[PDB]
Design a protein around this ligand. Structure first.
Ligand SMILES: *[C@@H]1O[C@H](CO)[C@@H](O)[C@H](O)[C@H]1NC(C)=O
Ligand SMILES: *[C@@H]1O[C@H](CO)[C@@H](O)[C@H](O)[C@H]1NC(C)=O
Ligand SMILES: *[C@@H]1O[C@H](CO)[C@@H](O)[C@H](O)[C@H]1NC(C)=O
Lengths: 360, 360, 361
């Protein structure tokens, strides 16, 4: 049992699915292991839809950080005081962004504008009430009942100022209802939206690339890691951030050194990652990742404010060289390892690359 | 059973009670049910006093947010470096405030200076040490010993520089101690205290009124609610604040919608409310309140900074009308409900009311 | 069980490492002792000791540390990945250098005991990031422990270092050349350059005792130091909001804490006889008194300290009871509170001319 590896064949839970797309939530982290109890308050939600579709109005009881891991998207957030907000999200093109935070209980709807590409979304959610994520759909479809349908009849009459039959016909009539929450929209309607919506760094080399961005407000960090077959992300550790990794495409070998099960005895937690798999990396635990195929991930780092990336090989951000460069440093290295301070520095300098190495 | 309902008849517990007043504490929220886990840190204290009384000095291990739900009170804070803070609180006259935060561990005493009216107080507590709330009384009365009496004879003689017998005669002697912590005081005493003390937005209509106040630093809000008999507070929800309702006087019928037991299936949680009953309205969960008689509530909303009030019926703060005014609002609403967008838009317009409605 | 706030050194510390040169101990979890101590689930104490002229090999831990020197001197160096370093000289008593420093989570660091005759005693508060356990990753390869480097695959180490595993093993891990442990002995001459640059980079008390506190506003934690003459008393008092953790550095003391019987209006006295390395917890707003039974010195940490206030129940300074007496109605109020009359109690409160610390022989 590698308690930090979440296989896709078990970890995700289908919430919705139809010919046009699907929604799944990842299982509680702390339920998998108590060693992951500081991740109790965080949950993952994944979404996928075919071209030209619309996700109907809803509001969830969690703070969402929506990331587009493929395609484009039109997001419109609706405010109770007659105000609206539009955002055009695209995973690549440097003109538009690929993430947007959505405040708890804010009604929003999503559109996949492209006629060819699918919208692939991954999001960090942070529930308000208790650790479970609750989505309140306003729609009445074949798949689900609208929440207004839960209140009592005269409460509905007295509110809307109409007779139930009128209110029902216009709102709830089984006839006329759409099938599910992911609906197929028409090309004409969305050109108008897209237009208005549209009006509104990296470290890598031959073998890989790494792009991170930190949201000081949420105290969260968002990465993008691309690696080509045979590449290697040399051993390293993130000082303060807890890192949640997700395979978007590809497969890779992961090696994590954690505590053996409060001692000075280690143990390795090796795993073989593939599409939709999620791997957790605790703050300060060393890790190395090698591309078994071309692979790209998206990661969320929690506790991101003032985090340092410490590398254990290569020319850039190497802490061992740094130790060797302290005032009486070489003497420290010679006592740390079996060689001499000179010998270790010699070895530490053989490698000419930084971050992403070739491992074959 | 409804996990959000706290029946006064069996949810409060008496700390102290005597011919002049009482103090009871509400049971733990997370104990009634795990759904209520993000409330494990808060508590509700209730206290009522007869006219012209004093609550003897004490300090508690919790932050208090005190609220006059009926009557008037003279609150005084005693700081160690020869300082006091005098506050005059009342429920109705717009000249004085109706609430006051009391920092943890601060010595304070209370007075009901009125010669005819009783004092009714409701307060939100945030214990510092663990889930329990601890009150340390300085007083020595027939109902309780002073905490000073838990110290050893030699610690006491040394501290005060007096033989244990002097100390006993002045501070603890049985003959002279009041009967309990609530005390009957004379009108002439509270005369000069009143002077000294006194020198130191609403939405509604004929059917009911709502008055809300947000304490930015505490990130908590207080709501006062009065609805005439037969009035309805139409279906609404709050984006992020989890709400705790308390009935001060009167009767009401409530319906809250939420998750049936992580899915899309809902459930209705209804309840018939009366005095001192408590009801938890989770953030983002739709709710409606129908007044069975003339009723007055007091509410505490926690995790309130930036919370929004989403209404589902009427002229003010209606989300549904706002979705209609979006770019292709009508088309979205069209796909959201059975009716066309023009139809549901016209429907939403029949109710001229806002917030409170006639439902006699 | 009996007294949930007392932690006997004998059965409360677990040894992480120990050898001829020094040792590292970790205190048992606060919550694991008593459910009453719930709000300290995420806090820990680590204790360390060193012989004169010793070095503690590099390591990074997954906890934010607040290091405090309880005796001796130390040179602390923090190593950053961007070719940057931070040097600190720490001492316990001479008012010229600091006695404490905070080490952020995941920062590589190493400590030296420059002194040729004195030991180095450190007490430290830890706030773990991952879960309640505190983990320490040692970079070193010694008879005692292997380096976390040794835990990756040979081929990954080869690709990483661009070296054949035989040379990688030679130069780094060969046991035919490693030290016996993580606390190692050094030469005064070796640290010649270091020490130089290191060295180049609130009290209320009387004849009976001295209190010295400081508050790291960023961390919302308070640091106290108490010294008391044998036979002295820190009269009854309480902290309004801070939860205080007390550690006996040297000496013996008698403590009396007044808490609840288990929400009643019934109190109960929790008492103990403290001595070297015992930890005693003092909850926010719970009354307490300490009688020094031998010359004694304490170091304590105060969590949830921003805005805290000290309330004494006896003495001429910070006396809350006299402060009630001087209120617009005070005397009337004090007369109903206690058995005697307001003038009578007010008379008694003034017999004690001392403040904070009092003679109790
Ligand atoms: C990332 O990797 C590719 C392939 O090695 C390289 O051409 C590219 O310049 C790198 N950086 C960016 C920003 O694409
Ligand atoms: C406020 O609410 C009460 C209760 O329904 C109502 O009777 C009263 O007319 C309202 N009036 C004003 C001025 O707010
Ligand atoms: C502090 O307390 C000590 C120890 O009890 C006392 O002897 C000393 O003189 C006090 N004052 C100063 C300045 O140290």
């Amino acid at each position: 049992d590698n308690p930090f590896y979440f296989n896709s064949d078990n970890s995700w839970n289908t919430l919705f699915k139809n010919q046009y797309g699907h929604i799944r939530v990842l299982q509680r982290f702390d339920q998998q292991s108590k060693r992951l109890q500081n991740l109790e308050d965080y949950r993952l939600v994944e979404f996928r839809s075919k071209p030209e579709t619309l996700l109907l109005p809803q509001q969830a009881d969690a703070e969402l950080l929506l990331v587009v891991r493929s395609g484009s998207a039109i997001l419109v957030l609706v405010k109770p005081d007659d105000r609206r907000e539009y955002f055009f999200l695209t995973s690549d093109n440097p003109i538009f962004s690929d993430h947007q935070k959505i405040p708890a209980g804010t009604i929003f709807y999503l559109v996949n504008p492209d006629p060819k590409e699918d919208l692939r979304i991954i999001q960090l959610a942070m529930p308000v009430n208790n650790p479970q994520i609750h989505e309140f759909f306003l729609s009445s479809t074949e798949a689900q009942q609208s929440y207004l349908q839960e209140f009592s009849k005269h409460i509905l009459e007295a509110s809307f100022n109409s007779k139930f039959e009128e209110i029902n016909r216009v709102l709830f009539e089984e006839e006329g209802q759409q099938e599910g929450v992911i609906v197929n929209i028409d090309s004409e309607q969305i050109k108008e939206l897209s237009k208005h919506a549209k009006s509104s760094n990296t470290i890598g080399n031959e073998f890989g690339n790494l792009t991170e961005r930190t949201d000081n407000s949420l105290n969260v960090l968002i990465s993008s890691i691309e690696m080509e077959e045979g590449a290697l992300f040399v051993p390293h550790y993130y000082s303060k951030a807890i890192v949640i990794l997700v395979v978007n495409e590809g497969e890779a070998h992961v090696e994590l050194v954690g505590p053996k099960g409060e001692t000075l005895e280690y143990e390795s937690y090796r795993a073989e990652l593939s599409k939709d798999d999620v791997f957790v990396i605790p703050a300060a635990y060393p890790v190395a990742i090698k591309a078994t195929s071309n692979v790209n991930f998206t990661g969320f780092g929690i506790n991101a404010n003032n985090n340092n990336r410490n590398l254990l090989a290569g020319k850039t951000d190497n802490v061992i060289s740094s130790i060797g460069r302290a005032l009486d440093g070489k003497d420290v290295l010679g006592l740390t390892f079996s060689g001499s301070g000179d010998e270790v520095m010699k070895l530490i300098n053989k490698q000419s690359g930084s971050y992403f190495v070739d491992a074959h």
